[PDB]
Coordinates of C-alpha atoms and ligand atoms in Angstrom, one line a residue:
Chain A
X1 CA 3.2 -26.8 -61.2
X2 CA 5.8 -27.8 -59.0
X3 CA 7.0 -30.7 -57.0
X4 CA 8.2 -28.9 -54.2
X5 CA 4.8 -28.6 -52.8
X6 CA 4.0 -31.9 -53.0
X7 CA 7.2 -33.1 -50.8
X8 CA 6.7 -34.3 -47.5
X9 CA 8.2 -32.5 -44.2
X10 CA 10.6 -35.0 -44.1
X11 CA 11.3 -35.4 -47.4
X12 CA 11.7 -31.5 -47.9
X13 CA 14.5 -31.7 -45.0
X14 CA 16.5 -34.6 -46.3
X15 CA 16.5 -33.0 -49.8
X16 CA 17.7 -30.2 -48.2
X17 CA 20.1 -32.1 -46.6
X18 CA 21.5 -33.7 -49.3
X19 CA 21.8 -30.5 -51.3
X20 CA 23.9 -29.8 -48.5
X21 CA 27.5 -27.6 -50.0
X22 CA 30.6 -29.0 -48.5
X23 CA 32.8 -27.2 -45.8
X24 CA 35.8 -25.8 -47.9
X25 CA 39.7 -25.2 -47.1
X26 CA 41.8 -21.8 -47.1
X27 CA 44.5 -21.8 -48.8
X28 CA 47.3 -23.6 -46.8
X29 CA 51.2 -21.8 -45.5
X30 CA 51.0 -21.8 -41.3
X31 CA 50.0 -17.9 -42.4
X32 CA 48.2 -16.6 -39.5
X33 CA 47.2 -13.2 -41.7
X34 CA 48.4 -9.7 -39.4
X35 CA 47.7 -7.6 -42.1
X36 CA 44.3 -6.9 -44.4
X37 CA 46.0 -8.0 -47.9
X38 CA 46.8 -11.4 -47.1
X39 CA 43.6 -11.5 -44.9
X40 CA 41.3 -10.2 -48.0
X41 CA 43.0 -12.6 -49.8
X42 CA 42.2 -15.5 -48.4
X43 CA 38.6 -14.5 -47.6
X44 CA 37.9 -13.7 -51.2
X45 CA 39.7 -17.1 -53.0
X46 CA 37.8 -18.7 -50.3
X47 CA 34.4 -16.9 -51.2
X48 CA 35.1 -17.1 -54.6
X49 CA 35.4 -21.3 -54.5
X50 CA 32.0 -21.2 -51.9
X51 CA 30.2 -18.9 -54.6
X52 CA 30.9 -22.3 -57.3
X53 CA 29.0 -24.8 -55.0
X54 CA 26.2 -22.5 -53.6
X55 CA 25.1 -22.1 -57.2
X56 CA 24.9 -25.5 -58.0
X57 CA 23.5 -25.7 -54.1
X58 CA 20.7 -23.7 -55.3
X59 CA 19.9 -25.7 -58.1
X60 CA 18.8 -28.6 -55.7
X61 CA 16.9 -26.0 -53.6
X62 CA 13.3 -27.4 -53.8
X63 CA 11.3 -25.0 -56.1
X64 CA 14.2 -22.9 -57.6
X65 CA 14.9 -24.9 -60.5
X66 CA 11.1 -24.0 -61.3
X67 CA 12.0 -20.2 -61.4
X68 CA 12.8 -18.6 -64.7
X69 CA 16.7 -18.1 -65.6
X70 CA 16.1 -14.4 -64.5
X71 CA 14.7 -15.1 -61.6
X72 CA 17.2 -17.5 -60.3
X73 CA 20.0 -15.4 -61.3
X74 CA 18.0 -12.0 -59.3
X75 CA 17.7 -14.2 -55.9
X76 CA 21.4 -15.6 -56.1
X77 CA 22.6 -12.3 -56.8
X78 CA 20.8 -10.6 -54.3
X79 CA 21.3 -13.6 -51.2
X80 CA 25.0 -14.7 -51.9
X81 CA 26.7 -12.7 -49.2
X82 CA 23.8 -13.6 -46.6
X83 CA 24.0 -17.1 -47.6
X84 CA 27.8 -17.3 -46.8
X85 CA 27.6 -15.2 -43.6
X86 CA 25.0 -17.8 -42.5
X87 CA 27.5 -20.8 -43.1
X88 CA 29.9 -19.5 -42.0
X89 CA 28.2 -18.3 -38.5
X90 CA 26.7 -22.0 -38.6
X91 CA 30.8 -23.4 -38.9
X92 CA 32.0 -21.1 -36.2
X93 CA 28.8 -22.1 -33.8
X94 CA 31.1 -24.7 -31.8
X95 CA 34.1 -22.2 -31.9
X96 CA 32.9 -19.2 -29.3
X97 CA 34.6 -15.9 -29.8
X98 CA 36.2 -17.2 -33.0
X99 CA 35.1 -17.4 -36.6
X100 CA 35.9 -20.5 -38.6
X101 CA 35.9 -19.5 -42.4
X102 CA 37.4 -22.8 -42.9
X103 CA 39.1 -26.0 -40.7
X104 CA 42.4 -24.5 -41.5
X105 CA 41.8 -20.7 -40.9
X106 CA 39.9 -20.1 -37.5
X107 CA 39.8 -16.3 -36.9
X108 CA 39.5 -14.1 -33.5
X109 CA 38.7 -10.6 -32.9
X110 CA 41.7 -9.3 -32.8
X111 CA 43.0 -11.2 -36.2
X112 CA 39.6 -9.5 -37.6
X113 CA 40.9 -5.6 -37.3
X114 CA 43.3 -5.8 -39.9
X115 CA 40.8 -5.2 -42.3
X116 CA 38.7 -2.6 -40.2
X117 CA 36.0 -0.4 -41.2
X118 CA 34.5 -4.1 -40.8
X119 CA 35.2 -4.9 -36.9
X120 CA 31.4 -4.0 -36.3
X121 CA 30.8 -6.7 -39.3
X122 CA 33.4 -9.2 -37.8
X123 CA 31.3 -8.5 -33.9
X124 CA 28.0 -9.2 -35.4
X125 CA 29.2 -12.4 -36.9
X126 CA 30.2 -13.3 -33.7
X127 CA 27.0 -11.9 -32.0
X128 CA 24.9 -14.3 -34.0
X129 CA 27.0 -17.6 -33.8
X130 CA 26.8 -17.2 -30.0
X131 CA 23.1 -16.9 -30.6
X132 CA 22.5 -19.6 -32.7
X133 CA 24.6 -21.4 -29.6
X134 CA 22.8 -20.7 -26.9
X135 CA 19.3 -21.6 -29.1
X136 CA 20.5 -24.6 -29.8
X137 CA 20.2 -24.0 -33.9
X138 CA 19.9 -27.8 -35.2
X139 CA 21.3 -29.1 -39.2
X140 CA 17.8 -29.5 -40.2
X141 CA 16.9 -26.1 -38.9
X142 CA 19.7 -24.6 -40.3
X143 CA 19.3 -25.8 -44.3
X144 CA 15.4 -24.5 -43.9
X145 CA 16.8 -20.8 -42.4
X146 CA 19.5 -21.0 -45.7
X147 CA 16.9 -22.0 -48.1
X148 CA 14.7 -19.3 -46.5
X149 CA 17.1 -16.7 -47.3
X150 CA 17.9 -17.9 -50.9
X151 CA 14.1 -17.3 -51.7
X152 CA 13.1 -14.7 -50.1
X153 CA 15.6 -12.2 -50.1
X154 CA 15.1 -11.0 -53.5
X155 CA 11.4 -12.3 -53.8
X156 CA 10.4 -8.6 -54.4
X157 CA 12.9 -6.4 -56.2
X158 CA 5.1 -14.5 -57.6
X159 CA 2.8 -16.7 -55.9
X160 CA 4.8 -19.8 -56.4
X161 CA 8.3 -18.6 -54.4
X162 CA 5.7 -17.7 -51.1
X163 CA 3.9 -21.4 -51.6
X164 CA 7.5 -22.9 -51.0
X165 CA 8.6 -20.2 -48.2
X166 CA 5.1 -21.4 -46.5
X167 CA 6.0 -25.1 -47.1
X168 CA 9.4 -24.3 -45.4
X169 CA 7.6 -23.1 -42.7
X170 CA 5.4 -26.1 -42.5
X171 CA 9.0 -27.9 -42.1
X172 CA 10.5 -25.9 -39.7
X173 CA 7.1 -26.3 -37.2
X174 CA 7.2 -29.9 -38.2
X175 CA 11.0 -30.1 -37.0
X176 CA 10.0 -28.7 -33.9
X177 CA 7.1 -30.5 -33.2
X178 CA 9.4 -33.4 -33.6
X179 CA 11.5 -32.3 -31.0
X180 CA 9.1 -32.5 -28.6
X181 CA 8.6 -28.9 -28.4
X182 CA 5.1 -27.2 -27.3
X183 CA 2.5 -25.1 -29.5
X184 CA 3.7 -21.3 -27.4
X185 CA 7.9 -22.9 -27.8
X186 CA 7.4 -23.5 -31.7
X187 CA 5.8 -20.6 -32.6
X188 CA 8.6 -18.8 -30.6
X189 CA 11.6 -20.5 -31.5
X190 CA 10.0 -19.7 -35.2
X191 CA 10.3 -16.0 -34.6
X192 CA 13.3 -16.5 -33.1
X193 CA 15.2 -18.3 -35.7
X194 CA 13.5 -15.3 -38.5
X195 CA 14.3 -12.3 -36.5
X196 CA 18.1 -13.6 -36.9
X197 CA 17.5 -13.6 -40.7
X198 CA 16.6 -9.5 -39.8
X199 CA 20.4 -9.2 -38.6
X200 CA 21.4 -11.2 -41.4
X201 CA 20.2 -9.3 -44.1
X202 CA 22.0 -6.3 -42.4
X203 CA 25.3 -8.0 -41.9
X204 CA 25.1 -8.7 -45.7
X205 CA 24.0 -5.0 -46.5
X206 CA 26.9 -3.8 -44.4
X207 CA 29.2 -6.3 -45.5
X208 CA 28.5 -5.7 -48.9
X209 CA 28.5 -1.8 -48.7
X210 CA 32.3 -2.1 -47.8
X211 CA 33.4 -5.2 -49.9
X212 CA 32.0 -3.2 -53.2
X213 CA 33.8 0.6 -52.1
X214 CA 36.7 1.3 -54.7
X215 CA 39.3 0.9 -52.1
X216 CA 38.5 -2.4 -50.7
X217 CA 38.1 -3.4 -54.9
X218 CA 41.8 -2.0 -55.0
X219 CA 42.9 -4.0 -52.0
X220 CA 43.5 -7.5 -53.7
X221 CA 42.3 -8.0 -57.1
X222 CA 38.8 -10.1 -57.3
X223 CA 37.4 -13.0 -59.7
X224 CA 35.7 -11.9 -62.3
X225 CA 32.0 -13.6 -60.8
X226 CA 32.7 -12.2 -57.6
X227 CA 33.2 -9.2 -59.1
X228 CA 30.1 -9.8 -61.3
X229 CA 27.8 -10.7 -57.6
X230 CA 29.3 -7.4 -56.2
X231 CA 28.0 -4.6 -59.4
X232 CA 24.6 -6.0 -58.8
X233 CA 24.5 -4.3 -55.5
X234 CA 25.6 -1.6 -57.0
X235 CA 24.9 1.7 -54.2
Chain B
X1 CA 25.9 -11.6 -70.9
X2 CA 26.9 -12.7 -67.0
X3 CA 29.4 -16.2 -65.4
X4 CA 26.2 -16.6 -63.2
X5 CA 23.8 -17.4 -66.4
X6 CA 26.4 -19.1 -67.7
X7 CA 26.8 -21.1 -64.3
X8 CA 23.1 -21.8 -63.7
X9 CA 22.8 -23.8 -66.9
X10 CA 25.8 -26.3 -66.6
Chain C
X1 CA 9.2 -5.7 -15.0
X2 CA 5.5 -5.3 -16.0
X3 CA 5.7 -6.2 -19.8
X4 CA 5.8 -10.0 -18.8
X5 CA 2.7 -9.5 -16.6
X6 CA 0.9 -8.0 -19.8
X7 CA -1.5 -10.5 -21.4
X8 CA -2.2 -10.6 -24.9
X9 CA -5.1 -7.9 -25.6
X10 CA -3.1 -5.4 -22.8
X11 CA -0.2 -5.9 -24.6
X12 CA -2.5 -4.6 -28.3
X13 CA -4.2 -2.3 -26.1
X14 CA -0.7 -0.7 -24.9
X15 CA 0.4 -0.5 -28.4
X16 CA -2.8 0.8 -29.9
X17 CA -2.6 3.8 -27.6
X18 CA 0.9 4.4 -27.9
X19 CA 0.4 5.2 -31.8
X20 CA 1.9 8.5 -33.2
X21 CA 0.0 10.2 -35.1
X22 CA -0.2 11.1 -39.2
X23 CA 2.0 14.2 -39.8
X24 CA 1.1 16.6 -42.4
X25 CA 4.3 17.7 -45.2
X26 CA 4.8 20.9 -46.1
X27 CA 3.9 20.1 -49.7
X28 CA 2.7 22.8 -52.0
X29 CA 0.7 21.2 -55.6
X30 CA 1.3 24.6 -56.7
X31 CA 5.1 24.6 -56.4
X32 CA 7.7 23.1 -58.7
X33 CA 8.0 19.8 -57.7
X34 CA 11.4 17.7 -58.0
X35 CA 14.0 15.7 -56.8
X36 CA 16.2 17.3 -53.5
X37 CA 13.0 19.6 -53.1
X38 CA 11.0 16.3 -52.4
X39 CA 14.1 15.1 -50.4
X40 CA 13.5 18.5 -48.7
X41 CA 10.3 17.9 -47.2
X42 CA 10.9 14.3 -46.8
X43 CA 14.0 15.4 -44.8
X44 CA 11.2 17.8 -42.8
X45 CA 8.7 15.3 -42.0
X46 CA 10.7 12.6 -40.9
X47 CA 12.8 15.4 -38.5
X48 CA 9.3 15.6 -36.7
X49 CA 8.1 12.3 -36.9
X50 CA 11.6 11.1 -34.9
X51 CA 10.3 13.3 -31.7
X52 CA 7.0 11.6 -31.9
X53 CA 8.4 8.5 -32.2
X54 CA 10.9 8.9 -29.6
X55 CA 8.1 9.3 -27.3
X56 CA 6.4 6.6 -28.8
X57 CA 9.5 4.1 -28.2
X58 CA 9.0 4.8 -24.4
X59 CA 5.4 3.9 -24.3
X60 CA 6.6 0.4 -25.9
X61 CA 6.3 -2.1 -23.1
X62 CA 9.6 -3.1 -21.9
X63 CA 11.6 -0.4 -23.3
X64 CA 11.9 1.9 -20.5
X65 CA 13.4 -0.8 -18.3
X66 CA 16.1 -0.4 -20.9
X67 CA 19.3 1.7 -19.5
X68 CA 19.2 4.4 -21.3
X69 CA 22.5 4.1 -23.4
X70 CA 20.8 0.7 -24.5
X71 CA 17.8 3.0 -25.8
X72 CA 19.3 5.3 -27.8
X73 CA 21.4 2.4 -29.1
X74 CA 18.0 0.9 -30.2
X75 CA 16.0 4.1 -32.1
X76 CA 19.9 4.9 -33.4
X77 CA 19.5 1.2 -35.4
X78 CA 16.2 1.3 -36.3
X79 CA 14.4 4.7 -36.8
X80 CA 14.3 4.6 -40.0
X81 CA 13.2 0.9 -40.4
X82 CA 10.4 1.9 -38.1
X83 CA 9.3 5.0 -40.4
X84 CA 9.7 3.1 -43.8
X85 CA 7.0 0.0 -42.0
X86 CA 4.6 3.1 -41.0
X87 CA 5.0 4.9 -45.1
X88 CA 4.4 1.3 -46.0
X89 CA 1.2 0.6 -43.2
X90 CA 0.2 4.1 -44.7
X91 CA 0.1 3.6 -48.3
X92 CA -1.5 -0.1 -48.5
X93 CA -5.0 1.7 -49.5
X94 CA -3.3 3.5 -52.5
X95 CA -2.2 1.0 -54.7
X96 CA 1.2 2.1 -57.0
X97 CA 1.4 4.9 -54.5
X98 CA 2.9 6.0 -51.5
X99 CA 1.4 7.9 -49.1
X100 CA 4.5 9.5 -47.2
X101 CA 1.7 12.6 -45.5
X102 CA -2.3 12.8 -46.3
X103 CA -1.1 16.2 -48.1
X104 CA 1.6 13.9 -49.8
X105 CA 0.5 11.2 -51.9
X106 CA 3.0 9.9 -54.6
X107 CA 3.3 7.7 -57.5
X108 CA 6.5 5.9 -58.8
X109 CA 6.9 8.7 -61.3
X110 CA 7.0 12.4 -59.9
X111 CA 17.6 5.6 -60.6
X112 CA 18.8 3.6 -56.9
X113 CA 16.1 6.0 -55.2
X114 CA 13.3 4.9 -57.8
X115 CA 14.5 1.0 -56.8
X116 CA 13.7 2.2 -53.3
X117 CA 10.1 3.6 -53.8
X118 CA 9.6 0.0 -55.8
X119 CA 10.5 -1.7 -53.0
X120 CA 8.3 0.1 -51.0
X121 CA 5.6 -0.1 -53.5
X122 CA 6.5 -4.3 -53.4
X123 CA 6.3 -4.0 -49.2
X124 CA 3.0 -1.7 -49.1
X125 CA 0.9 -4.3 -52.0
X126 CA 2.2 -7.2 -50.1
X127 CA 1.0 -5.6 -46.5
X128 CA -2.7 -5.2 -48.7
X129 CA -2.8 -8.9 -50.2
X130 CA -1.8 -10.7 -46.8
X131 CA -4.8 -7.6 -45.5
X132 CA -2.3 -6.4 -42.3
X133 CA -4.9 -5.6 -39.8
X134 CA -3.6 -2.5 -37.2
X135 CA -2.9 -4.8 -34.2
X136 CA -0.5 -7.1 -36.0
X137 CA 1.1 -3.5 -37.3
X138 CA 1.8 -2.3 -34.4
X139 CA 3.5 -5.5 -33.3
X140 CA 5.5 -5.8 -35.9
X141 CA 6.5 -2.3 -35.2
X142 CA 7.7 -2.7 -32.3
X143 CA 9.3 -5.8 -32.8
X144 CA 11.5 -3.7 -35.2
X145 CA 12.4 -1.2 -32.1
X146 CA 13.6 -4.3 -30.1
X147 CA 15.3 -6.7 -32.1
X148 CA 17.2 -4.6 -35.0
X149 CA 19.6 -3.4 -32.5
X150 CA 20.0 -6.7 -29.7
X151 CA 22.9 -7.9 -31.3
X152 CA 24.8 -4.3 -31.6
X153 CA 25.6 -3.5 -28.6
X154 CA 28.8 -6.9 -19.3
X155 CA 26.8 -7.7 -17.5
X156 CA 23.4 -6.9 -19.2
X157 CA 20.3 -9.1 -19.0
X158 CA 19.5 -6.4 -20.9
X159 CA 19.0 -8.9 -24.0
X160 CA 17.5 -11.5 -21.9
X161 CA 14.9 -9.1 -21.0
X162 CA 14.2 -8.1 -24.7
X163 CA 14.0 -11.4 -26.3
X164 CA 11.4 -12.3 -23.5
X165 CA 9.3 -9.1 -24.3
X166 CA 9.9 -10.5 -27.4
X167 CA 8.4 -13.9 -27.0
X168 CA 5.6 -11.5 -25.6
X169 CA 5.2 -10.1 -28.9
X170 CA 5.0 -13.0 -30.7
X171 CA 2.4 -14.8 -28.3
X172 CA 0.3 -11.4 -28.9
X173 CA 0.6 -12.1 -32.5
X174 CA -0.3 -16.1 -32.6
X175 CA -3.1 -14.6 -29.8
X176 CA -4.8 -12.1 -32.6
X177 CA -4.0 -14.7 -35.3
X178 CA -5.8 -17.4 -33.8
X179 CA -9.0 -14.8 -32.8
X180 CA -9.2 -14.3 -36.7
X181 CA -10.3 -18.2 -37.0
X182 CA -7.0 -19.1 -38.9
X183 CA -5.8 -22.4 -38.1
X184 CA -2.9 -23.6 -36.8
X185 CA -1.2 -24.1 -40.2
X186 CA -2.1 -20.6 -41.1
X187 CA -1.3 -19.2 -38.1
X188 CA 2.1 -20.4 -38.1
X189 CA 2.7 -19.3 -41.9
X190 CA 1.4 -15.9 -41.2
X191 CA 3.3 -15.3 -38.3
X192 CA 6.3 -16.5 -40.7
X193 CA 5.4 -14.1 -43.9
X194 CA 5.2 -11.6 -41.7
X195 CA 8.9 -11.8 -39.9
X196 CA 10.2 -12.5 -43.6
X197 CA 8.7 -8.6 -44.9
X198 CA 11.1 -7.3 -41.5
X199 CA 14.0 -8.2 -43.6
X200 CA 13.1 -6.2 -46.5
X201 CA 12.4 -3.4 -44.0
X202 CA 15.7 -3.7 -42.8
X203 CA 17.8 -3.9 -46.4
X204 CA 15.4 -1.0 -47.6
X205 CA 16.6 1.1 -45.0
X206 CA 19.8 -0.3 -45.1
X207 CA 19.4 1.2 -48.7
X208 CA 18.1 4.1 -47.9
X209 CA 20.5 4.9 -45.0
X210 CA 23.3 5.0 -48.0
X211 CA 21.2 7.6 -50.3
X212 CA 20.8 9.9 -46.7
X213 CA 24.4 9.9 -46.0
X214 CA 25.5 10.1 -49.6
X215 CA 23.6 13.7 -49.9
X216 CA 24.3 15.0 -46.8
X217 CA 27.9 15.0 -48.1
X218 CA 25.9 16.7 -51.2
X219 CA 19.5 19.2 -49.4
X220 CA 20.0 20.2 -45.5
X221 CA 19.9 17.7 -42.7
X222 CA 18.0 18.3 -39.6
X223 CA 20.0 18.6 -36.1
X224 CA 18.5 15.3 -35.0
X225 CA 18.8 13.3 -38.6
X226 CA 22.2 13.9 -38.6
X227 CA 23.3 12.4 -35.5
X228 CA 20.2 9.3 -36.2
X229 CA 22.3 9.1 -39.4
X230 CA 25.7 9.6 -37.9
X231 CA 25.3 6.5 -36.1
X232 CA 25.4 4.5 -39.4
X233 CA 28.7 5.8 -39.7
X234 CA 30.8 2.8 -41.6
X235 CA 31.8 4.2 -45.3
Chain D
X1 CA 25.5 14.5 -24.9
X2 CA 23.2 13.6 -28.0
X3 CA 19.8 15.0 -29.0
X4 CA 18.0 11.7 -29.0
X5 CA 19.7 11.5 -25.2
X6 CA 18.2 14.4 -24.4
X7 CA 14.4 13.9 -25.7
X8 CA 14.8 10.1 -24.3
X9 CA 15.7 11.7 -21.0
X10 CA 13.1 14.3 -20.8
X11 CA 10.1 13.6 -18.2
Ligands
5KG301 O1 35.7 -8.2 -40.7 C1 35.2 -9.4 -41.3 C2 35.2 -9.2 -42.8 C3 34.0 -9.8 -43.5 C4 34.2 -9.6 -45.0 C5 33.1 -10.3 -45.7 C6 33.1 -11.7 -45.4 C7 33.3 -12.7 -46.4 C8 33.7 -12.3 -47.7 C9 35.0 -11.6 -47.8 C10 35.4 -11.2 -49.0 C11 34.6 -11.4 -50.2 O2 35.0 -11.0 -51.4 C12 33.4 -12.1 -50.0 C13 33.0 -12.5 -48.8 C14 33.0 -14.0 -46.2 C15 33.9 -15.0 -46.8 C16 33.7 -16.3 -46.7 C17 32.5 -16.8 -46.1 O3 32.3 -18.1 -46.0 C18 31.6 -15.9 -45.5 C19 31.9 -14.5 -45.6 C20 33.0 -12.1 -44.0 C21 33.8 -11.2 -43.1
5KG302 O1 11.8 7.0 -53.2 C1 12.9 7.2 -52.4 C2 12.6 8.0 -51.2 C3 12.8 7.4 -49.9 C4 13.8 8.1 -49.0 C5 13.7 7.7 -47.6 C6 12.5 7.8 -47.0 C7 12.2 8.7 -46.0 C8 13.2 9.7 -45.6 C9 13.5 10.7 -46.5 C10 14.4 11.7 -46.1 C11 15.0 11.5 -44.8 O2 15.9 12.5 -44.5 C12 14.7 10.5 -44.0 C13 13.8 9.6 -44.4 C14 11.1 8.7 -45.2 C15 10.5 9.8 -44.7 C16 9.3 9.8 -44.0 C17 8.8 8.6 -43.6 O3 7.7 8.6 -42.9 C18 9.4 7.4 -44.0 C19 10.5 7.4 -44.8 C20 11.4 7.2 -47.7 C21 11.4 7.3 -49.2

């Protein structure tokens, strides 16, 4: 038995909260990356230092610490590029046309084809921060959608994980509620907010496809558990 | 043997 | 338009008639079966389910107020998400099978394209223990058709006008939910399990999509497939 | 241009 079921909504939101990663630096030098080395470069040290804290993140998830070693190592592995694409579209939510990786290294469209192959990546990024704008996307909203993702990305590839992804949902409707929002608005803004997780898990797919392709590997050399979260999508 | 088990547990 | 005129049975009722029908494979029990030869008549049947769902996409309410750059745009992203969720509404009945034609019926048995059928497999037993009924199928189906491409594409209200047809689709949903005598609870965690299985659909054909173009380069591609699949064009 | 243009198109 667990104890995530037996959390509160509130409860369940400031444990998530709390479990809350913190916003990272790049790598200093006035830099301003023109070219797809230094650029890949700064992405991966930065993804590599994320990767640390969302694993320890996870931990504090309500529920996952209940999951066999297997099983928490399967949903990390399978959710670590969607759960970084998410911050990171979260961070760059108060920066239109611009994605903030970090404070110190706030990226436009133009800085984003020096990698290429990945513009279309780099546009959807974009596409769903200004979503998540203009919906108004809230904290507590945001840590259920991350938690969502965490769980049920790799839920497949059992009872217990869909028992906490309905008790998230029972969160999100209560966070809603709270707002003052009607019965028709929550149950919208629900599908809303999960549709996004659709494009999401595409933007990680995508993402992934290129970030694991020999040449990209070849591009700037990679830690050795990044390397280690790429293999397991491995075609 | 994977960083990520080793990770989980510490 | 007329979609957001369109009350909730109307909008099941539209759907419901719009259905494509069950194609027959060109499967022969008698000959050889393998590998590429099954990819063969896969490759056949799905070349002639794309007309009939092409047709199909312009009975979907809202869609042919669409331009029709924005259309093709739409079945280019999700055509095959759309025939993986009908293989999958197919095969709930035949449990560790999949039933790709009623002449074509399939087990697990007959390495990243066996991790493809699973998943399938996982999608199909999870459609048969929530018991999908036809009406929320051919929401969700359609829900596919609109959303998987909105963020892929001024000025357009284009996207305005789909996530309202959207909100449609998701008031038809709570609408047949809450005629099932499910309460408010359920209906809302439903609603949510069922969104959640879209983003498997997505990173199966995501998947999939990968294996199609990885051959082609390789069993013969239909005229039509190739330009579906051309779309998907990042390496 | 495209096939899927063309069977979109036809009425
Ligand atoms: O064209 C844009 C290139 C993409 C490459 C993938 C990507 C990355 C990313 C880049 C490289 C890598 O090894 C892992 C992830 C990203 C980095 C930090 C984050 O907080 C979120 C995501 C985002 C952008
Ligand atoms: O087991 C791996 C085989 C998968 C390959 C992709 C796939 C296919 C598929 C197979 C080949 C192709 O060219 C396009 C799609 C599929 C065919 C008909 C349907 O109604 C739905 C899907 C489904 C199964």
């Amino acid at each position: 038995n667990s104890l995530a079921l037996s959390l509160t909504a509130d409860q369940m939101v400031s444990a998530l909260l709390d479990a809350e990663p913190p916003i990272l630096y790049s790598e200093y030098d006035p830099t301003r990356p023109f070219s797809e080395a230094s650029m890949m470069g700064l992405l991966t040290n930065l993804a590599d230092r994320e990767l640390v804290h969302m694993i320890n993140w996870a931990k504090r998830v309500p529920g996952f610490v209940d999951l066999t070693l297997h099983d928490q190592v399967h949903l990390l592995e399978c959710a670590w590029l969607e759960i970084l694409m998410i911050g990171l579209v979260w961070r760059s939510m108060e920066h239109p046309g611009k994605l903030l990786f970090a404070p110190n290294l706030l990226l436009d469209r133009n800085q984003g084809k020096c990698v290429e192959g990945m513009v279309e990546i780099f546009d959807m990024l974009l596409a769903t921060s200004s979503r998540f704008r203009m919906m108004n996307l809230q904290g507590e909203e945001f840590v259920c959608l991350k938690s969502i993702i965490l769980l049920n990305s790799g839920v497949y590839t059992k009872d217990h994980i869909h028992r906490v992804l309905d008790k998230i949902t029972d969160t999100l409707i209560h966070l809603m509620a709270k707002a003052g929002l009607t019965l028709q608005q929550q149950h919208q803004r629900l599908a809303q907010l999960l549709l996004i997780l659709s494009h999401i898990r595409h933007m990680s797919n995508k993402g992934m496809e290129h970030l694991y392709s020999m040449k990209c590997k070849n591009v700037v050399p990679l830690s050795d558990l990044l390397l280690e979260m790429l293999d397991a999508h491995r075609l | 043997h994977k960083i990520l088990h080793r990770l989980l547990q510490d």
